């Protein structure tokens, strides 16, 4: 129930090769003030689908 | 669902009788005897009902001179030719599993003659 011989350095990278992170890069640009906001998300100013909902 | 809807909208029975879970019931089921056909009685009560249309059920509980041979019919299979009522029952709930072990002197229920 254990490794029997110590693995090499190089392998450790490859096992780590798919775990590379994925960037978003799909920024959405709003129509009211233009503050960058995630597509489908109310803006940091609480805006989405253009209108001022909530209010904070 | 609209496929068989017309398919079997024309295969459910035509003129079924009156029962409850506990109404007396007898499915004249055309069975094989010799070389000719005739009707033979299976009179009983409903202990269990299935409002499912053609694949549904209406239950008959006979007493077979001590040990019955129990039947789960298809109301809408033409193998059930017809039903002729002798009396309905007075039931509360949906499924009269109690109709069986209830026997002899007490086995009866009154008529729900309303």
């Amino acid at each position: 129930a254990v490794q029997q011989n110590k693995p090499t350095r190089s392998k450790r990278g490859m096992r780590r090769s798919h775990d590379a992170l994925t960037a978003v890069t799909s920024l959405s640009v709003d129509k009211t003030s233009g503050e960058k906001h995630l597509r489908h998300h109310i803006t940091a100013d609480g805006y989405y689908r253009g209108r001022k909902v909530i209010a904070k | 669902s609209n496929i068989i809807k017309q398919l079997e909208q024309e295969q459910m029975k035509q003129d079924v009788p009156s029962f409850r879970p506990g109404d007396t019931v007898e499915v004249k089921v055309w069975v094989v005897e010799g070389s000719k056909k005739r009707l033979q009685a299976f009179e009983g009560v409903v202990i269990a009902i299935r409002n499912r249309g053609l694949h549904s059920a209406f239950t008959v509980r006979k007493i077979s001179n001590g040990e019955g041979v129990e039947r789960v019919f298809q109301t809408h299979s033409p193998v059930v030719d017809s039903i002729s009522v002798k009396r309905r029952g007075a039931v509360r709930k949906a499924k009269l599993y109690y109709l069986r072990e209830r026997t002899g002197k007490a086995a009866r229920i009154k008529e729900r003659l309303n």
Binding site: - | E67, G68, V69, F73, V79, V80
Partner: protein, 122 residues
């Protein structure tokens, strides 16, 4: 639906009220056999002055199992209790002379035609 040592009631006038499934006939491994199945079983009791005595062994011609009986529309006439009718070794036919209670028309083939002559039911 009679299996090793099946509780067995008797439909006949022999006196034995006792039978018990020990071997199905007709083919190896034959598991759930009833209705018109013949199997090897042994008698465990009889009436005082009956034609069998404690220990006599025979097979079976079934007429009831707790599983009841299917019919042309998928419908079933279902048995309440596992009560049965034995058979001879050589002449077949239930070893008795008077039989009572439900059998199965599935036993109707002129081989058990003996019983089908005079029954109260089927």
């Amino acid at each position: 639906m009679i299996q090793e040592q099946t509780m067995l009631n008797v439909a006949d006038n022999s006196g034995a009220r006792r039978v018990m499934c020990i071997k199905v006939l007709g083919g190896s491994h034959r598991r759930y056999a009833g209705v018109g199945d013949i199997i090897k079983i042994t008698i465990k009791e009889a009436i005082p002055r009956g034609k069998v005595k404690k220990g006599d062994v025979l097979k079976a011609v079934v007429v009831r199992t707790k599983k009841g009986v299917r019919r042309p529309d998928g419908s079933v006439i279902r048995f309440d209790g596992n009560a049965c009718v034995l058979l001879n070794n050589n002449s077949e036919q239930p070893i008795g002379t008077r039989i009572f209670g439900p059998v199965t028309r599935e036993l109707r083939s002129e081989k058990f035609m003996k019983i089908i002559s005079l029954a109260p039911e089927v």
